[PDB]
Amino acid sequence: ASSWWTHVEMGPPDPILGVTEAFKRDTNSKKMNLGVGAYRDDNGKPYVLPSVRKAEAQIAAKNLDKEYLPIGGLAEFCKASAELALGENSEVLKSGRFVTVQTISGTGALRIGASFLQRFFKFSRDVFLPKPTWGNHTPIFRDAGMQLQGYRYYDPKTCGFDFTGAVEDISKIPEQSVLLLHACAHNPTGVDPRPEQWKEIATVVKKRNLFAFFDMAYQGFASGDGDKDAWAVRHFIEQGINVCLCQSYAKNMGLYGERVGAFTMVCKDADEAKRVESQLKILIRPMYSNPPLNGARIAAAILNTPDLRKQWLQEVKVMADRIIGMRTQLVSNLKKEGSTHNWQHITDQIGMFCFTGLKPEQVERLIKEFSIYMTKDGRISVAGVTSSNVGYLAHAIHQVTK
Amino acid sequence: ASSWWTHVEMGPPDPILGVTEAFKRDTNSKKMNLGVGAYRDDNGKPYVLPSVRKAEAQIAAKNLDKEYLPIGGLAEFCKASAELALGENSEVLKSGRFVTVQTISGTGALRIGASFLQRFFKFSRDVFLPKPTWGNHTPIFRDAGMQLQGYRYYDPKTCGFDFTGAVEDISKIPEQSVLLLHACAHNPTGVDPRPEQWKEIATVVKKRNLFAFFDMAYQGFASGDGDKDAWAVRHFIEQGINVCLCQSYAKNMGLYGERVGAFTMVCKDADEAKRVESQLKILIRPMYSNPPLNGARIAAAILNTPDLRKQWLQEVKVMADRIIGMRTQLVSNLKKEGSTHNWQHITDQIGMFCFTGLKPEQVERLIKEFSIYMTKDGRISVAGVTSSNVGYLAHAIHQVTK
Ligand SMILES: Cc1ncc(COP(=O)(O)O)c(C=O)c1O
Ligand SMILES: Cc1ncc(COP(=O)(O)O)c(C=O)c1O
């Protein structure tokens, strides 16, 4: 053709960016933006952890260099991330039968894992995801070369986890097929299985010899306790199932821009771990010579230092308490407004994001009348909820669902 | 199988890391490491630009947030990078018929460009590279899905650019085939075509309607003048050829760990530019939600501020002068030692890396006897050369080539 890219077509707009722009152009004083993808403080401003600032001050005092990091990443950061994910007294660390490589946050880890599965996981080409899964998950596996399937995870009838349906779908999954399991808060729905349900899922996976691909990105932030959030992964590991974790420190540490993340794979032996490390480095090098330095250095400094680690844990627990308090206040105000609908699932759900279960027509009613901007599926970000405007949101929800 | 990764094999060791480890384990006092991939000062320590430190201090004073950046990247950084690459008075900027997206340094840009070519460049599947090309170039295009070809670039007989052979190979390239052209210092050889040779190559490309994929990663660092280093790209653009630039600020700015880089594509119209921008964002999002923030912010602060830009240009010119002085001193000391070999190609070559043209047996002779560690092909890093040890290196080369 005359032009190289004359056949290139305009890409579809991102709904999240459209919602954000619609909120920005809105002139109503009482407008709210529940489509935000990051945590916010009470005032609604972006929140930077004081532990992060202390780590930055310490690093600036150290006056370190900016040379390239190993292809795998910073050794201290990888070791600290593995210890945090698996626990300080995990048998895996003692045996050393694990590999951890720094990557570009969770998305990068997910991509690296998908590329590794495409290159080496000869058993199957199908990746199973929850039916209401994170949006980027699909494109990542599609670009990496993996076909995608789905299983039931969320039950719209009870607005909760569909345990029986999920068990049946997992049991129907063909053997030796990779499975994706949101470790903690589900990204779009924030519904997590109960520990007994997690044990049942682990037993089914062990019986079917499936491959688990955990995606822990809200560790600590989900409930303020890192051990309880990582309980499912540790249970899977002690059951004898080798799993992969995609850890993202964007939320639990507030390093959204720093792109901090680690991809760890559990192997049977240290020889297998180092072979997987070599192949992972071989895969990583064409994508990027090395991961970034500043964010990983900050994360390693916070994790290794005891006082900084304690302060970071306290801050994360505080943010988790704020999220839970916002959910509880929303439910209480909905009860006060006189709504007879059962909003227990709002308190039951854990994480930033919530489906109140509102119908799309209710969504347009909220957008046009009360100037509340939210996605069509019904997901709202609790971080956007404020103690000042929680009453307004509850009143609007009650009026729409009247 | 019983194990998921029992069939995974140990990856081949990286020769550069092996050379570095061999240098580290060496106990000779007069040992040198010419395999370093980054610039070093006179003392041999890593060099951090004072302009970078001033920018970091200014950013710390600003007390900015760490929220996610747009998928394309920081707007200020992209605009500044495009202006620096194309020139302040470029017609492309006035017409706005360009797209620039931040990426993970040069490697990332190269990958993004290869992915875009795989998805949209329906004309051909073959990418032509110089015969002595950068090592990572191959794996990047192989993983992205592009077949790779080669053309003659370096003439071992004269240790210089093979102009006639390169012209014949380019003319034999099939029409509408993407071509890779190291903009400045050839990574492995540091040989660049003369401006008349660049004009001839541009005329041949325009006649054959080839697609040019420039990889400018040493702008400014090559000779201390950004305009002269970017002269080939500007000539190609004014000739009417739409080209792609993979800019890496790792060297010209010393931000090796910060992973700073931009991929810019020249289009005919602004509509084509924005369509390409949307498709590039669609491609980028699965790989990583957004590029990192700290390095791009530092680069934008340095480029936009006039005093910081002037100081950065002065520092880059100083490092380029140091590299040229090291080359000249090496040639002068080789002449003093009495060697009759023609070492003019050492001064002719521009960039960090040089092929002195030594045979592999001479390489093992240097490694075993004089404890000088270097790659088998003969490439040496001028940044590793020091005013103190340049005489020792010249004496060793003369003794080996005696
Ligand atoms: C499922 C999932 N993956 C990954 C991430 C983190 O993505 P990023 O890599 O952009 O930090 C999140 C955070 O919202 C998430 O919910
Ligand atoms: C040909 C080439 N491409 C790209 C780069 C930049 O690589 P990175 O992305 O690791 O900064 C360099 C720097 O040495 C190079 O020589």
Numbering used by the authors:
A (entry chain C), B (entry chain A): 29 to 430
What does the paper say about this structure?
Here we report the use of single particle cryo-EM to identify multiple proteins from three enriched heterogeneous fractions prepared from human liver mitochondrial lysate. Using this approach, we were able to simultaneously identify and solve cryo-EM structures of nine different human mitochondrial enzymes: short chain acyl-CoA dehydrogenase (SCAD), medium chain acyl-CoA dehydrogenase (MCAD), isovaleryl-CoA dehydrogenase (IVD), delta (3, 5)-delta dienoyl-CoA isomerase (ECH1), aspartate aminotransferase (GOT2), glutamate dehydrogenase (GLUD1), mitochondrial superoxide dismutase 2 (SOD2), catalase (CAT), and mitochondrial aldehyde dehydrogenase (ALDH2). Functionally, the three acyl-CoA dehydrogenases—SCAD, MCAD and IVD—are involved in beta oxidation and amino acid catabolism. Finally, SOD2, CAT, and ALDH2 are all involved in clearing toxic byproducts of oxidative respiration.
